[PDB]
Design a protein around this ligand. Structure first.
Ligand SMILES: CCCCCCCC/C=C\CCCCCCCC(=O)OC[C@H](COP(=O)(O)OCC[N+](C)(C)C)OC(=O)CCCCCCC/C=C\CCCCCCCC
Ligand SMILES: CCCCCCCC/C=C\CCCCCCCC(=O)OC[C@H](COP(=O)(O)OCC[N+](C)(C)C)OC(=O)CCCCCCC/C=C\CCCCCCCC
Ligand SMILES: CCCCCCCCCCCCCCCCCC(=O)OC[C@H](COP(=O)(O)OC[C@H](N)C(=O)O)OC(=O)CCCCCCCCCCCCCCCCC
Ligand SMILES: CCCCCCCCCCCCCCCCCC(=O)OC[C@H](COP(=O)(O)OC[C@H](N)C(=O)O)OC(=O)CCCCCCCCCCCCCCCCC
Ligand SMILES: CC(C)CCC[C@@H](C)[C@H]1CC[C@H]2[C@@H]3CC=C4C[C@@H](OC(=O)CCC(=O)O)CC[C@]4(C)[C@H]3CC[C@]12C
Ligand SMILES: CCCCCCCCCCCCCCCCCCOC[C@@H](O)COP(=O)(O)OCC[N+](C)(C)C
Ligand SMILES: *[C@@H]1O[C@H](CO)[C@@H](O[C@@H]2O[C@H](CO)[C@@H](O)[C@H](O)[C@H]2NC(C)=O)[C@H](O)[C@H]1NC(C)=O
Ligand SMILES: *[C@@H]1O[C@H](CO)[C@@H](O)[C@H](O)[C@H]1NC(C)=O
Ligand SMILES: *[C@@H]1O[C@H](CO)[C@@H](O)[C@H](O)[C@H]1NC(C)=O
Ligand code: NA
Lengths: 1413, 173, 119
């Protein structure tokens, strides 16, 4: 125990040395407790005042023999050193070392160091340090030599065991020491200063608990190994597809047809440099740095008359966008997986290759962008869950051990002021004053939600007097409470303190910002005392800085270091190389020249936007650096972000909530008031009622039963499904080309009259068969009904000439809802709706808590920006005028008086009012259209004053703060509630998959068996002498390994191909590919001659034979297709068969085969959720087509991407299912007032007028779609995680045989020699010890045999089958097959023994034991 | 936006008719200056003669009897950028039967480049006493009526037989 | 613009003197816009005499004071604008200046060499 503490004197050194010598002449893990860097066990209690901070002897026995000395600080921190002389000089006893040690383990040592490091961090933020700073740099370089020397002197240097160079983080300190001095004495500056960001990492080694965190993040990476492999593989397979489909498509341009002066594409293409000159021979859209793309098919982009499409010149985006080489293709694929600016790319590939190629992008988004990311997330979550579990198990165990130690220790021991202040304690009332303050907070926030830009000075007066009246009443609450409850008693509660701080900040404002005006907005959080999901947001946030605070700090450090490294590396390149990235030779919006702009790129990368900034980095600083750095930030960073998100989720989800206390244990004063209200409103109404009282046919049933037969028949059901689908399909023909197809337009009007006839009849039949109740109580019937009702209204109005009254015309757009009849008929769609509607109630609450939080941000946006995004712009070049000239609205208008193309214009999406602020916040949260909103905010000056470049640069904080709280912590809350809900959905129904249908579950169950089978029989050998040798070669493992290396070589040969490659290179790659095929075919035949037929008994073997015939035919047919036929498109698509050869590497990989079986299990749920989504798109397409097809073509809306056709609507909808570009699609739908649109615009081919859009309808559309979209993809993720999580934690197998039962009977015949089928309970404990394993029960059996609860018949006898079944159940466990096998046993016994009278059970072995006791 | 719809080929004596000529520029953001010229060849006469020219917001009509006092401009208005070159006949005679050529002459203005282009649409017109109605409408109306009656009969037949069967079952019970 | 030259260049009378001058301009050297002027002043407060200039091509002004001893000895595309003074004479002692503009790079470069002629 404690009495063990003694000063290492030479004598104990000599007694350790003697022992080691004894061990040598003769010629274990230590207390994890004691293990250094740990608290000294309380078992030892306090240290003698002279033993602290002194070389003491080793406690732990393991080391007691080896040579060591431990030292403990005044905080009981254990520090282990080496008794061996430091560099063969200093001894523990030596005063010189005694001092080094004294400093090394003290707190003024490490605080000093924390300061030093943090101050150096502040100095690393400066981009052009002044000169009084080299002295400081010397001064910091020295606070570092000191500590390193102290460690070397005290722990010794490198030779021993616990010595300086043994610690892995001391290596970092050592490099910091050497890079500093060495480079200084030698004297790139940038390189030297980046070597200095390594000082920023000493923080991990100094702030406590930062290493455990960093080590745990290294544990999340090692488990991510097979997913990372699958990821690279899939990315490469898709890259090789895009390389083959698209090689050189992005190069296509529109080249002028008439050239003067005997000129050629060739000559012109050697003599051109500027974009001013490429704009004379090629076609460029105004404001575009790239030449416009074109194509050669009818579904590609078209060129203007006068130009012809041709492949020549650079690729788009400074040449970084392409499928020309494998390396660029791989970059486009990583990009598509991360969905970073992917719509730009999808749009460029469709324009240049055709609209058909969209299938390619669909597959990539579904496989790479969704599934691979899902796998990553799942693996990381599983890592974290196993980790938490280890923590707890070990933590609980340790706590138990400590409590046991405590228990063992216990065992060893064994006047006027008074009056009125009490009146104020009475005046404050739980039901009333507190409920009042609640009403006032809400009223105050609503009153502040009315500030808006076009506000009259009256409406402003009323707002400020109100803002004062509320202030005074919150402050009276403050003062009164403070005089009633004593001031010390008052600042005890944390809610009180927060309210007090708000009040004081409001009073300071009254004595006097614009931002200060909005802090009174946090009084809302005082509704968390009663509203329980607002209390969940508060706890997520609270944990971020409390129990996960260290991880949060590590995230902060990493962002900081990336920001400063980035700056030091590219910062000066951004200034020097600027004309390349900007024509006005001034810095772009995003750049790394200073610390702030640099932090901003990193944060944008965490948000998921990296490519557009990287293009620029690559242009000013080179490809290699940029790609190394931007990739490091994406990996490490997204990982720290994800681990934070998951830690928050898990914790706040199940760790924090434990129903420890009662629901509002101290009856929420709100609930007390509610009880008072129940008393009052009920009692008073009852008294008022009392006062009022004081004052005063087989044949019809037969038609019913017939209707039932029909409406319930499978042919009725199929007539109708067919009919819904045809009527839904007829709507897709109503596009802007309808007047070019006269016959189909007439066919469809008549088809519509019929469609309505049929559905009316169906409805009538259902009425007759079901009756008005079983029909009007059903929601699916209610939906059919309404559809047929709108249909009938349109029909009857139309046949009565009411076909153009405008309201009736808008009712016709409602036919887009006819495909909803499709939901009831298909189970897959019906079960997903059922799943989604169950979630609605929990979702509704997150949304209220989320709408409110987003409202504080909205009101602040308004206070900050309302009226300040108006600018004077020159319309022909679309550029803002300066502020030197035209700095005001008055001057903008004077300029209008002279120059025609001058407009004072406000952004469409803005913060003029709270409603608009909400739309702006949605764009910011989703990262779609946010850049522009931020620019208007950071250019802001004041109302009616011209914006100036980065005038309010630090308004970006507003946006970073919203992203963290409004997006990051809000999503966290949303996921945590969805997960407890979906989990509950499964529980009430027995755990069956919520998203999968009955028949589909039967298939699912059959597949879970596929991936589960046990080993098979060895393939019989061919007895023939030569065939047998062939067999032993093919069946060898070396053969398989060689086949696998050849597949890798084949993959390499495909990756070598590239645009512009010589004809000789083409020819060598063709012939190499011919030898691969002849090798893979002979592989086939050797296996096929040695394994014989047994070849086709293996599924992979059959994939392998289907790969050889797709390969052989592809080569021959592509040769045939390039010669006696011509079709470049066909040639490229049929050469894709070569991918078959490379897929066969999954037979080889055992961890991506298992991840891929996980995807196959999830396909039914996904097909079902995907059917829902497709049909949802189809509706939104029909609607887009009826409302948005004439709108002006600006921004996202253009000649290929628009809502003019059904095909064109689906393209746009697929793009926005991911949220990409939605803001570009809404912008033109917000033009409603001229000069934005023309109300009378004439459209050739139509009688429709105007190109305007309706903002109300538009906003609704896009927001509705993005929300439903998000919701259905949450479900895709649930489904996938469910699969991954079981796939990864599940195993199955069965182990029994017929000889076991024979053993049972052969042992039974020794105890029942007459074959009575019964034994005495006396003999059961000897019988069960005379069976062999697996049925064996070893002595002492009797406790296990009493726990099996066997039945007993007359005479304390037990039957043969009961003992067999109980022992079988013991080995197999409690599976569902045990009760079916049991049923068979009962049936087969009842058919063999008709004498029921001898089998009646009177007692059981447990019941009997209980009776005996 | 712009959709090229072919013209109707039948006009009735004594009424008005709108011959439709629509030519769309291959890309809408482009800027052009378009003019039109129309030539007409009457039935059984073998030469196309010029009947009108529209340019710079003004119709110039040729001295022909068969079209004097009877043609107005039904196409694009207010621009030099025409995509609709439709004409309108205010009083149809039998001398308007024949074939028409609509000639579109478009000058596109690009960056350092002007491209002069031309397009020709041909329209055939038959002049009749009364509006012969369309095959499509006729057959589609009849086809709707026949399909509906067939469905009704089928629904009745099945109702009849099943009703009889259930009555028989009730009697058996 | 960083321009690298020797501040002092000591050359024996009668030998050839290469006046080295390179410049670190990131933008590629466009011969249609690149500008180089080499001048000569006897002293810091004396008159400069331009003796070689690159406008579209190398223009050697053939100043009488140098006879035909000046040659270009650089490569603009490789960021080298050095000149050669053959068979140096004592009167060549003085200050030589390399002026450089590489549009669209904003900043003009200036190198200054003090040439001293040894016995
Ligand atoms: C923690 C650690 C995290 C990972 C950190 C390291 C990750 C990646 C390091 C990548 C290093 C790349 C070095 C490239 C060297 C290079 O400079 O090579 C040149 C090639 C070809 O350039 P060019 O000759 O056509 O130039 C012509 C210019 N033109 C066409 C634009 C006009 O550039 C190319 O192929 C571009 C190659 C792009 C390759 C994809 C990068 C990896 C992306 C995702 C990986 C997953 C994460
Ligand atoms: C652009 C690329 C263009 C080139 C592509 C070329 C190849 C494309 C298609 C070829 C498909 C050929 C048929 C594939 C399935 C073959 C098969 O027979 O598959 C059977 C398995 C179940 O049989 P088993 O493995 O239990 O056989 C028992 C024997 N034992 C357990 C010992 C292994 O069913 C399953 O999982 C089926 C899984 C099917 C997944 C196909 C994905 C194709 C991509
Ligand atoms: C599309 C998305 C994926 C694209 C890349 C696909 C690469 C795979 C190519 C092979 C395609 C043909 C497969 C033919 C059947 C092969 C087959 O059934 O083998 C059997 C293997 C068995 O895995 P296991 O180690 O037992 O893992 C089960 C758990 N443990 O199981 C397998 O090897 C096959 C798993 C196939 C999963 C297919 C998912 C849909 C595709
Ligand atoms: C070309 C290589 C073909 C393999 C030649 C070797 C050979 O003939 O004996 C090797 C095997 C023998 O099995 P079998 O002929 O199918 O008869 C037994 C039968 N399968 C059975 O189940 O008893 O023969 C086979 O493996 C025959 C199957 C070859 C595949 C046929 C497809 C293309 C014709
Ligand atoms: C005016 C003429 C031309 C048409 C009349 C149509 C009504 C007879 C239909 C339309 C709405 C139907 C009603 C819809 C709702 C109900 C409530 C339903 O009762 C319940 O659902 C109780 C549910 C519960 O207690 O939880 C009984 C059938 C009833 C009256 C239906 C009876 C038949 C109604 C009245
Ligand atoms: C309206 O169309 C009527 C048809 O759908 C009728 O077909 P059924 O679905 O009624 O097919 C006959 C079903 N029974 C009545 C024979 C069972
Ligand atoms: C908007 O900016 C203009 C700057 O031109 C302010 O204007 C005045 O400009 C006229 C003509 O240049 C002068 O006669 C006045 O002397 C200027 N004012 C001053 C104070 O010198 C104009 O005042 C600004 N708008 C507002 C509302 O202040
Ligand atoms: C072809 O180019 C030459 C330029 O050397 C020119 O003299 C000649 O007129 C050109 N021919 C034609 C037909 O334009
Ligand atoms: C039609 O042409 C005939 C000459 O063939 C002429 O007499 C008659 O007036 C014309 N009718 C009209 C309506 O122009
Ligand atoms: Na980006």
């Amino acid at each position: 125990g404690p009495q063990s503490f003694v000063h290492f004197t030479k004598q104990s050194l000599a007694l350790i040395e003697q022992r080691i010598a004894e061990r040598k002449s003769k010629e274990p893990k230590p207390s994890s407790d004691l293990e250094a860097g740990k608290q000294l066990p309380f078992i030892y209690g306090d240290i003698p005042p002279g033993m602290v901070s002194e070389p003491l002897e080793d406690l732990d026995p393991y080391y007691a023999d080896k040579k060591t000395f431990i030292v403990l600080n005044k905080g009981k921190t254990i520090f282990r050193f080496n008794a061996t002389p430091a560099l063969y000089m200093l001894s523990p006893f030596s005063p010189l070392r005694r001092i080094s040690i004294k400093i090394l383990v003290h707190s003024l040592f490490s605080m000093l160091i924390m300061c030093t490091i943090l101050t150096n961090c502040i100095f690393m933020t400066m981009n052009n340090p002044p000169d009084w700073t080299k002295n400081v740099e010397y001064t910091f370089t020295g606070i570092y030599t000191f500590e390193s020397l102290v460690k070397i002197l005290a722990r010794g240097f490198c030779v021993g065991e616990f010595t300086f160079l043994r610690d892995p983080w001391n290596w970092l300190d050592f490099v910091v020491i050497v890079f500093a001095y060495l480079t200084e004495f030698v004297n790139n500056v940038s390189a030297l200063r980046t070597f200095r960001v390594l000082r920023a990492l000493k923080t991990i080694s100094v702030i406590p608990g930062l290493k455990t965190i960093v080590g745990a993040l290294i544990q999340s990476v090692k488990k991510l190994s097979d997913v990372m492999i699958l990821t690279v593989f899939c990315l490469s397979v898709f890259a090789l597809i895009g390389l083959q489909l698209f090689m050189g498509n992005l190069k296509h341009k529109c080249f002028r047809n008439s050239l003067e002066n005997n000129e050629t594409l060739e000559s012109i293409m050697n003599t051109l440099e500027s974009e001013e000159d490429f704009r004379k021979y090629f076609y460029y859209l105004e404001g575009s740095k790239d030449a416009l793309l074109c194509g050669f098919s009818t579904d590609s982009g078209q060129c203007p008359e006068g130009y012809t499409c041709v492949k020549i010149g650079r690729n788009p985006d400074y040449g970084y966008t392409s499928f020309d080489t494998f390396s660029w293709a791989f970059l486009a694929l990583f990009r598509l997986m991360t969905q970073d600016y992917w719509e730009n790319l999808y749009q460029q590939t469709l324009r240049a290759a055709g609209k058909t190629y969209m299938i390619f992008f669909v597959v990539v988004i579904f496989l790479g962008s969704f599934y691979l990311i899902n796998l990553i997330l799942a693996v990381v979550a599983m890592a974290y869950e196993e980790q938490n579990q280890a923590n707890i198990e070990e933590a609980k165990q340790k706590e138990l051990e400590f409590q046991q130690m405590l228990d063992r220790l216990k065992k060893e021991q064994e006047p006027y002021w008074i009056k009125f202040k009490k009146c104020i304690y009475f005046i404050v009332m739980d039901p009333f004053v507190d409920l009042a303050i609640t009403i006032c907070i809400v009223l105050n926030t609503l009153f502040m939600a009315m500030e808006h830009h076009p506000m009259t000075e009256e409406f402003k007066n009323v707002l400020a007097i109100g803002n004062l009246v509320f202030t005074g009443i919150f402050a009276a609450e403050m003062v009164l409470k403070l005089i009633a409850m004593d001031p010390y008693e008052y600042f005890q509660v944390g809610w009180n303190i927060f309210d007090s701080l708000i009040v004081t900040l409001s009073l300071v404002e009254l004595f006097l910002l614009s931002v200060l005006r909005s802090f009174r907005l946090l009084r809302v959080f005082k509704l968390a005392k009663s509203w329980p999901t607002l209390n969940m947001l508060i706890k997520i946030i609270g944990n971020s800085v409390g129990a996960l605070g260290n991880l949060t700090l590590v995230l902060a450090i990493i962002v900081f270091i990336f920001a400063v490294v980035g700056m030091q590396l590219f910062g000066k390149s951004y200034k020097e190389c600027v004309c390349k990235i900007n024509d006005d030779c001034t810095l772009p919006r995003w750049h790394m020249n200073d610390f702030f702009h640099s932090f901003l790129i990193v944060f944008r990368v965490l948000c998921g936007e990296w490519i557009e900034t990287m293009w620029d980095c690559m242009e000013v600083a080179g490809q290699a650096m940029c790609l190394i750095v931007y990739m490091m930030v994406m990996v490490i960073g997204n990982l720290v972000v994800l681990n934070l998100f998951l830690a928050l989720l898990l914790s706040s989800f199940s760790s924090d909530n434990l129903t420890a206390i009662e629901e509002d244990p101290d009856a929420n004063n709100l609930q007390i008031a509610v009880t008072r209200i129940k008393k009052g409103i009920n009692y008073v109404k009852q008294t008022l009622r009392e006062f009022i009282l004081k004052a005063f046919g087989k044949i019809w049933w037969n038609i019913r039963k017939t209707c039932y037969k029909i409406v319930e028949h499978s042919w009725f059901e199929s007539f109708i499904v067919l009919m819904i689908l045809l009527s839904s399909g007829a709507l897709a023909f109503e596009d802007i080309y309808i007047e070019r197809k006269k016959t189909i337009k007439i066919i469809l009007e008549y088809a519509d009259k019929i469609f309505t006839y049929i559905f009316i009849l169906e409805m009538l039949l259902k009425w007759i068969a079901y009756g008005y109740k079983t029909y009007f109580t059903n929601a699916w019937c209610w939906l059919d009904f309404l559809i047929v009702d709108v249909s009938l209204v349109t029909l009857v109005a139309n046949t009565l000439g009411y076909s153009d009254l405008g309201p009736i015309k808008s009712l016709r757009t409602l036919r887009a809802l006819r495909p909803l009849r499709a939901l009831s008929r298909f189970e897959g769609m019906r079960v997903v709706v059922n799943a989604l509607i169950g979630a609605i109630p929990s979702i509704m609450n997150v949304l209220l808590v989320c709408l409110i939080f987003w409202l504080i941000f909205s009101i602040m946006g308004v206070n900050l920006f309302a009226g300040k995004f108006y600018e004077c712009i020159n319309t022909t070049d679309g550029s803002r005028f300066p502020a030197s000239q035209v700095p005001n609205r008055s001057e903008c208008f004077a300029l209008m008086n002279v120059s025609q193309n001058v407009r004072w214009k406000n952004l469409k999406v803005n913060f003029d009012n709270v409603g608009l602020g909400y739309l702006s916040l949605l764009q910011v949260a989703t990262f779609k259209g946010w850049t522009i909103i931020m620019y208007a905010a950071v250019d802001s000056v004041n109302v009616d004053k011209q914006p100036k470049y980065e005038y309010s640069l630090y308004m970006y904080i507003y946006f970073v703060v919203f992203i963290i709280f409004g997006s990051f912590f809000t999503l966290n809350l949303f996921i945590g509630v969805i997960i407890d809900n979906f989990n509950q959905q499964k529980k009430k129904l027995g755990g069956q998959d919520i998203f999968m249908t009955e028949e589909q579950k039967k298939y699912y169950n059959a597949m879970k068996k596929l991936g589960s089978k046990k080993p098979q029989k060895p393939i019989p050998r061919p007895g023939n002498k030569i065939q047998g040798c062939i067999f032993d070669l093919v069946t060898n493992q070396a053969f398989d390994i060689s086949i696998m290396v050849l597949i890798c070589l084949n993959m390499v040969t495909m990756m070598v191909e590239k645009e512009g490659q010589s004809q000789h290179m083409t020819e060598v790659l063709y012939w190499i590919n011919v030898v691969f095929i002849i090798l893979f075919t002979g592989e086939c035949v050797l296996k096929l001659i040695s394994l014989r037929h047994y070849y086709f008994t293996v599924g992979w073997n059959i994939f392998d034979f289907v790969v050889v015939i797709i390969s052989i035919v592809g080569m021959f047919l592509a040769d045939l297709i390039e010669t006696y036929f011509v079709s470049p498109t066909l040639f490229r698509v049929i050469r894709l068969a070569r991918i078959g050869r490379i897929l066969r590497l999954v037979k080889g990989a055992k961890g991506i085969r298992t991840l891929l079986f996980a995807l196959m299990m999830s396909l039914p749920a996904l097909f079902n959720i995907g059917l829902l989504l497709f049909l949802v798109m189809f509706i939104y397409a029909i609607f887009g087509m009826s409302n948005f097809a004439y709108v002006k073509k600006e921004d996202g809306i253009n000649d290929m991407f628009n809502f003019e056709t059904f095909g064109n609507s689906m393209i746009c909808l697929f793009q926005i299912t991911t949220s990409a570009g939605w803001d570009g699609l809404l912008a033109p739908i917000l033009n409603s007032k001229p000069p934005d649109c023309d109300p009378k615009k004439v459209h050739p081919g139509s009688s429709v007028e105007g190109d305007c859009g309706n903002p109300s309808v538009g906003i609704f559309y896009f927001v509705s779609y993005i929300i439903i979209s998000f919701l259905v993809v949450v479900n895709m993720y649930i489904a996938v995680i469910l699969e991954n999580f079981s796939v990864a934690t599940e195993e199955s197998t069965e182990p029994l045989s017929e000889d076991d039962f024979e053993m049972f009977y052969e042992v039974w015949e020794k105890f029942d020699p007459d074959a009575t089928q019964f034994i005495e309970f006396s003999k059961l404990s000897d019988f069960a010890a005379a069976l062999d394993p697996p049925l064996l029960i070893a002595k002492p059996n009797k406790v296990q045999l009493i726990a099996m609860d066997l039945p007993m018949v007359s005479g304390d006898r037990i039957h043969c089958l009961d003992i067999l079944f109980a022992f079988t159940k013991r080995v197999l466990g409690e599976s569902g097959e045990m009760d079916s096998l049991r049923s068979q046993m009962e049936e087969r016994f009842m058919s063999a023994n008709p004498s029921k009278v001898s089998y009646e059970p009177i007692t059981t072995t447990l019941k009997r034991k209980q009776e005996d006791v | 936006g712009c959709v090229e719809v072919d013209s109707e080929t039948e006009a009735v004596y004594g009424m008005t008719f709108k011959i439709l000529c629509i030519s769309c520029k291959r890309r809408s953001e482009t800027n052009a200056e378009t003019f039109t010229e129309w030539t007409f060849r009457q039935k059984g006469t073998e030469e196309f003669v010029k009947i009108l020219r529209y340019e710079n917001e003004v119709l110039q009509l040729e001295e022909d009897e068969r079209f004097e006092g009877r043609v107005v401009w039904n196409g694009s208005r207010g621009t030099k950028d025409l995509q609709d070159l439709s004409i309108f006949i205010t009083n149809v005679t039998y001398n308007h039967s024949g074939d028409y050529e609509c000639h579109v002459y478009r000058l596109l203005f690009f960056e350092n480049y002007e491209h002069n282009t031309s397009v020709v649409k041909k329209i055939h017109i038959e002049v009749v006493d009364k509006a012969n109605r369309d095959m499509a409408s006729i057959v589609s109306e009849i086809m709707m009526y026949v399909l509906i009656v067939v469905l009704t009969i089928w629904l009745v037949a099945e109702m009849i037989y099943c009703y009889k069967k259930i009555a028989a079952a009730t009697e058996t019970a | 613009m960083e321009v690298t030259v020797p501040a002092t260049l000591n050359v024996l009378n009668g030998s050839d003197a290469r006046l080295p001058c390179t410049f670190n301009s990131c933008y590629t050297v466009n011969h249609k816009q690149f500008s180089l002027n080499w001048t000569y002043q006897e002293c810091n407060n004396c008159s400069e005499e331009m003796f070689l200039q690159f406008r579209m091509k190398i223009i050697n002004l053939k100043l009488e004071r140098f006879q035909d001893r000046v040659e270009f000895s650089g490569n603009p595309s490789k960021y080298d604008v050095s000149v050669m003074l053959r068979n140096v004479q004592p009167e060549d002692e003085g200050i030589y200046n390399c002026y450089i503009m590489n549009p669209p790079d904003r900043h003009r470069g200036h190198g200054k060499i003090h040439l001293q002629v040894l016995m």
